[PDB]
Amino acid sequence: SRRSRSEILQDVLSRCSPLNIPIEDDQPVKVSFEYSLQKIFRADVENDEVDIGLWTTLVWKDRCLNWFNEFTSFKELTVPIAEIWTPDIFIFDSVGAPEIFSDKLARVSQDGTVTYVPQLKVRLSCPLADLKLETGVTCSLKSGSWTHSTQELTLEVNAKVDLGDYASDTRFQLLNATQQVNRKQYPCCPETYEDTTLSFTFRKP
Amino acid sequence: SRRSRSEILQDVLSRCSPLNIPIEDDQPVKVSFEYSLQKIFRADVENDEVDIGLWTTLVWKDRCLNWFNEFTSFKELTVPIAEIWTPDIFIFDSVGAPEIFSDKLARVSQDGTVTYVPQLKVRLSCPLADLKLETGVTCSLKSGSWTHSTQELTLEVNAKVDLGDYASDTRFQLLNATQQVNRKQYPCCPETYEDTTLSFTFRKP
Amino acid sequence: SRRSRSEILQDVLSRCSPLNIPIEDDQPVKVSFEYSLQKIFRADVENDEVDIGLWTTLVWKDRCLNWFNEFTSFKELTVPIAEIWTPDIFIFDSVGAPEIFSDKLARVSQDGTVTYVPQLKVRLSCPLADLKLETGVTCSLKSGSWTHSTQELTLEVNAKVDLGDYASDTRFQLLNATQQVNRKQYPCCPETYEDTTLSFTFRKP
Amino acid sequence: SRRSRSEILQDVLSRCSPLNIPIEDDQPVKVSFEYSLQKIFRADVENDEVDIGLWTTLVWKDRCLNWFNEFTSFKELTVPIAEIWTPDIFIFDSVGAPEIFSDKLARVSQDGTVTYVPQLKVRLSCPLADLKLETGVTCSLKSGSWTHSTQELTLEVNAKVDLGDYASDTRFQLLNATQQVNRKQYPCCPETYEDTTLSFTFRKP
Amino acid sequence: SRRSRSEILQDVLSRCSPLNIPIEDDQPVKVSFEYSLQKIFRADVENDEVDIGLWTTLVWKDRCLNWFNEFTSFKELTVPIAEIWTPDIFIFDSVGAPEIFSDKLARVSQDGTVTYVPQLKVRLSCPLADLKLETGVTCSLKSGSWTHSTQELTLEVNAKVDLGDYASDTRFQLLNATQQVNRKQYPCCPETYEDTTLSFTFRKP
Amino acid sequence: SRRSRSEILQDVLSRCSPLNIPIEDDQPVKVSFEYSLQKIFRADVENDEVDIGLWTTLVWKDRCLNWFNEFTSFKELTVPIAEIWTPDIFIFDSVGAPEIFSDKLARVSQDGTVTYVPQLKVRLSCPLADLKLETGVTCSLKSGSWTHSTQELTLEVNAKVDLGDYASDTRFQLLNATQQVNRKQYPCCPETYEDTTLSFTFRKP
Amino acid sequence: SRRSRSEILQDVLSRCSPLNIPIEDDQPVKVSFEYSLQKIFRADVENDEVDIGLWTTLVWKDRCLNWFNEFTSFKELTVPIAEIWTPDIFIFDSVGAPEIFSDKLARVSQDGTVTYVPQLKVRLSCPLADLKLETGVTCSLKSGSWTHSTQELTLEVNAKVDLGDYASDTRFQLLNATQQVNRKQYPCCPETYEDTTLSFTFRKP
Amino acid sequence: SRRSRSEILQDVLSRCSPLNIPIEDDQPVKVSFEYSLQKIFRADVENDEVDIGLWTTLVWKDRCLNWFNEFTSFKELTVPIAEIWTPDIFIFDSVGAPEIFSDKLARVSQDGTVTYVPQLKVRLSCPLADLKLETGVTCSLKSGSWTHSTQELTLEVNAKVDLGDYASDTRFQLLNATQQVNRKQYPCCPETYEDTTLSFTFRKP
Amino acid sequence: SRRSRSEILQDVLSRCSPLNIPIEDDQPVKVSFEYSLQKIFRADVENDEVDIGLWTTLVWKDRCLNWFNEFTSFKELTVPIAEIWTPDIFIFDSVGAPEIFSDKLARVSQDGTVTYVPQLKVRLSCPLADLKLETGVTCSLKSGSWTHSTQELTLEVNAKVDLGDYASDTRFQLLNATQQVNRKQYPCCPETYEDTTLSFTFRKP
């Protein structure tokens, strides 16, 4: 490949951090979260579980060190997700372990910015009843850091929900996809925790 | 750069997989999809095509092998998208080939998680008529794997649509951006296919 | 690690580009944008500022060169965001500098596709008043390239907003999260600029 | 076994690279991709998922060092895939984690060329509807590096799709199998990402 | 040509690195970035896109090995950009793929320093409105590694913006060109990402 | 992207100036300054500090050189502010370091004209007392080059203050926003220094 | 064809050099450059871009080896440009990627001399204003190696500009076409770079 | 002429071999031989000599080196036979030195292939007696390398004898022209020598 | 398919030649050229460019080897144009790169004869003025090998121009379509070059 690029990955991977938040100063890490709802694959009336094929856009900035002076070189490199720390975002009410559709690869930038987009199929609790009716049905699932409080991780969203990718001839039509950010509390801890509640309204076409 | 990081990329890239889904056991790959609608650049009344500047958040987990024992080292590395497998998510009704705004870089994590966020301008079919009226106009585009059925790839969404990034003084105001996941069928195949339908309601401000 | 992977990162990073848009021919770069609203952490009545914990899914394609003939090898690599060029997407009305929750890692693919997902906490202007009422309150923030016009960068969104990740017991319930793409103009320049307006309607549960 | 062969594997494995792309100079890694569609095992109308039994031919060249002077000796050796870096190629819309039919073994050549062919069963989103009709049904799935952009990994194909291996008495007849290479962009990143879209048209015989 | 020079290129190109960051030790790669704004070619009111003809100065240091003892010989050689790794710097909000005005050639120095300057035309989102007014209009575009976080790639700037080259009789007068460096975060990743925001204030003369 | 645009940026950035005022002949650089007062976020009675969310329109002309003959090509390009020289305009009485809301991107034009518009939150000294009264309260802050005298930098304003963007439901109503240009002297130096005094009269609505 | 000719091409192509400057001794490579201005196709007043249909005469000598003793045989052969190294000559200010009118074929001679003449349409920056006036308008574009300094590549011209081929009934009359050679410097490098500035004065007939 | 062609001849002639067989590896040189019998000019009964006007097609491949990278250029050049090595093919039983009708020019090809066709008048021993009879008369002459054994030079023939060119109103009619290849031995040497025996049967018309 | 046919393609493609002119003996390659003018799609008065939809009939004979004895089998096979060498015929004055309407497939025959017919849209320089007049307008474009001289490639035509296919209700009526063969010279080279000048006289009906 390119030798210049080669040095970059090795320096960051070999020299530049183990799993530890590199930021010493006054910063929580914000992670932008967006959902591209690909398809609502299936509904289970007996189980009251619904399946979503989604990919999640995750963006964050990590502190990286510039060592060897940056010359005009390879700006973004791609690396396996395993190589770097990723956020704990989880669906609060998944019925089953989510499965991963896509390769675990993340693009990293010199500024430290990282973009990771997994594709996933998730089963979440939701009653399908009245899917056939014109009114349709509503489901909600909340995503957010399991462990991190708002102080440690701040979640942000650019927009409501990305319908564009949605499969044209999906079994179910999308009434409205929303991603509203909310902060709430748990009995364990005094700290506020932030999650993104994805509320999807859909019916069978 | 850092030698420790250096070894990481090379081991994953040189030793650890060619384009092949690394997961042998009972897992489909789920890809989370989210849309950050940046701007609705233009509307064409004669053509009935509309232009969106979007970035797509894609997340997936790939199986990677740990070889050399992981010491505290570079957790995420960045690499070009070309280096690793990426999902086939496509807009079902694009008028033209989408163009890429941003560098193709993806951040990868040790767990195998990958985050890839492309920025794109897409032209899709949509009638602009009555954009001026208070009611505004509605458009929908579905994104989803072209080839993969729900069994192979499951799509998931965290939330509806990310408005926050939306340009303040865009030509068109955003009534509501939604990303609803749906599964549907095609005559070619008995399998369900999942797509995320992005339904955007907008009018000129 | 894997030697095969090793060569990949170095070739792309060391040999294959400095910060410069590699695409000579007729292409703007499109960046798909999606928001996964994790949580609405806090509201400040006196300040009229609201905090969102979000992650942003960003996807783009960069032109990379294949040098050493691609054998079946490591498809995605992960690299720090600093290594590669990332888009300038910014919140138009942030009160404060956004902080980064997650590591800056991006997965890159051989096709050149990059996925970067940062996690972020952002403070934006928004009046909280009447959060308690049933009607709730509405806020909007626009994200989009600061410098780039629609010609340089096109933004696209798959869906409205990803609620699924939203934290279950967040302080505030999500009425609806939307990401509508819009294009608008500024007095500085004749060119259209595209942004994604994230409109979030929420109330306290 | 043969002592001469013995030295070869150990030298390459023990001495000659960890996961790191070994190529410093001006080369992206190209990976040739071909599909041998073995069978379309099943179609699921409710799920809209289809199952393919495929093996994927992956070829790439890695840089290896000649140390001990090459005498006429064992030209190709076989080794477990785990030993060396493999590409991240993933199906964009797999419903589930792909499972692996065959042993993970790859033949390597002195020139550095590697041939790895996994056998896989993949579930992908696709509507089966109208499978019985004469017209049949069409499905598409895209394979490509998740993380790597076109700059890092370039994908190439020799031909359209390999029908010859196709099971004679499969439940479904093959109208046409195609593998067209395409490059596209994502909102995350400005870089182009390349994927191979496998479009399969089939009907029940 | 000169035989002495001849050996130099071949040794570096043939022997001395594939795409891999060559730096093992504690160094991120810093890439200096500067903009020479040549001209603001056009403004599009309907599209809200603006066109800039720019060349980008990119400088970085790669680790090269001295083999054959350096005698007084050819100090810099020139080579095609394809030969060596280049950074992923991309415009965050380009509407279209940037096109390349100049040959892709980069001068390399013995110390390892590389200077690459592409000339480019870029279309970026920006509202032209009020270009005629005395106040003029402001546009901003951010450039930075797509994939690389601040840890992998550090971006630096010598000065604000180079007006000197600016075309004398350009359609639009330059009020002020600024390049301020900033670091920000994305929802995907905890790491900080650094970008250079080019803010250009211009009006029609 | 577009190759034509590509050459432009590289030529200006790589070849066409480091931080140095390119103008040899009889010209001071004039920088037009305008304020768009977005919002008066907060008032602190104990501290006597007030917060303004503003964006500053800055325009200047830099001398650029035309090299490769300008063909009809990309007229404006966008670049990070870091790439080019920007003026030192500072608020004389900021209590704290101003924070930057927007990406640092500036549009540059062929004529050399540059438009840069940062968005900022600034804390300045000002007594809030009697904000509730009908009379309201007055505050003033002066912006101007710290180092540059009137001879080096001349500041100009098109109009008084831009209220239009002002947030409709801001905590404080705007009685009158004024930007009067004035020149004054300091004990350090015999030269006149020019600043723009922003006098804002506001009260709580 | 002729067997004698057959051996010639194969020997030079198969045996006699890869991309590397074959000249070891004290020689820079001189490339003669001449322009045959075919037509000025169009002028764009809004864009300030002008289109030229040109063919470029390029001549250089490469070192080739005589192997099989040269008998009276085929003196020049023709081959695709891809087969052999060609110079990087580029227009400094092209707005867009130049397009190629003619086949890429170059005649090579036994002495090593090569003649390559591409036909091209180029868009370059140039103000058309006052094209109608008797005075007409002047435009200039500079061509020259992007990477190569005067030491590596020396450019030479036989004459001013070739009008003879100029289309008789072109939209624009040619006042004077000039090709003056000049050497100039760039901030990147201490070395002199040589370019041919084509200054064309034309008006509408 | 063409400069490109010019370099070719000089490189091959000046740099690329003196009379020496350039092929080091396991190859004899094969020379294809064909005869185009133009005319049987005269018969001498007392002398028993017959005159043939023939041209001989000779083809061989020489190893040439490619130096300066082959661009699309002049594919075959022509050169005097003196310039390159030619085979020793001689008529075994010529009564007199053969005379040369045509210019000694040979076409050479890039692959190294050379085609040389001399035109010659040869006097060979042959009894004319019974030329008038219906049976006619037969003559044979053998051509082949004088010095070279079959190991050094291998002779090949495509076909029997080329009558087409034969002069229509020649004094003698051609019954049959044959060129059979044969290998035979001589007392001097143990090696086999190969010759082409031209057996011509002709009578007076 | 047919096994007999199968062997044929593989033998010719796999065994029987790489890009090299297979003919060693005294033959230039003649390529017959014919034009079937399908339609004159458009005329551009400002640009002085005209668009032709044409298909080009190209015929040539290549030397192929018969290996396995030809039995009565598949006489012509079809193959992609990429598989075999095609001539460099180019339009001398195309304004833009020609685009290809039809699949690149060529029929090959056992004798070695190949027939390739591309469909193309070409933009060429031509003044449209007086298209409306009865006299109409004349345009000419020359097609011919770019690199090859008359010695290497000889062009032949069967007839003047094929009107029969011409679209009945085309915007422009065809006065006369002619294809005259001519040979001419260029300053680069002493050799004659042959081209077919297509002179089309047309007017609006």
Author numbering:
A (entry chain A), B (entry chain A), C (entry chain A), D (entry chain E), E (entry chain E), F (entry chain B), ...: 1 to 205
Describing publication, verbatim:
Acetylcholine-binding proteins (AChBP) have been described in several gastropods and, more recently, also in an annelid. They are homo-pentamers and water soluble homologues of the extracellular, pentameric ligand-binding domain (LBD) of the membrane-bound nicotinic acetylcholine receptors (nAChR) that belong to the Cys-loop receptor superfamily. In AChBP, the pentameric quaternary structure and the overall subunit features of nAChR-LBD are fully conserved; this also includes the typical pocket-like active site at the five inter-subunit interfaces, with several strictly conserved aromatic residues for ligand binding, and a C-loop for controlled access to the active site. We retrieved full-length sequences of two distinct subunits (termed BgAChBP1 and BgAChBP2), encompassing 205 amino acids plus signal peptide and sharing 52% sequence identity. The resulting cryo-EM structure is a regular pentagonal dodecahedron ∼22 nm in diameter and assembled from twelve ring-like pentamers; each pentamer measures 7–8 nm in height and width and comprises a central channel that is ∼2 nm in diameter.
Recombinant BgAChBP1 formed small particles that we interpreted as pentamers, and much larger particles that are indistinguishable from the native rosette-like protein. We docked twelve copies of the homology-modeled BgAChBP1 pentamer into the 6-Å cryo-EM structure. The correlation coefficient of the fitting was 0.89 as deduced from matching the cryo-EM structure and a density map that was simulated from the molecular model at 6 Å resolution. In addition, BgAChBP1 shows an unprecedented opportunity for a third disulfide bridge, C16↔C64, connecting loops L1 and L3. This bridge is lacking in all other studied members of the Cys-loop receptor superfamily, and it is also absent in BgAChBP2. The potential attachment site in BgAChBP1 for N-linked glycans, N176, is localized next to the C-terminus. The trigonal ring encompasses six different structural elements, each present as three copies: (i) Helix α1 close to the N-terminus of each subunit; (ii) disulfide bridge C16↔C64 that is specific for BgAChBP1 and tethers the C-terminal end of helix α1 to loop L3 of the same subunit; (iii) salt bridge R2↔D26 attaching the N-terminal end of helix α1 to loop L1 of a neighbored subunit from the same pentamer. These specific reinforcements of the N-terminal region of the BgAChBP1 subunit might be required for withstanding the stretching forces inflicted by the other three elements that form the inter-pentamer bridges: (iv) salt bridge D25↔R63 connecting loops L1 and L3 of two subunits from adjacent pentamers; (v) salt bridge R3↔E70 joining the N-terminal end of helix α1 and loop L3 from two subunits of adjacent pentamers; (vi) a central hydrophobic cluster of three F71 residues delivered from three different pentamers. Recombinant BgAChBP1 is able to form a homo-oligomeric dodecahedron, indicating that such a structure also exists within the animal.
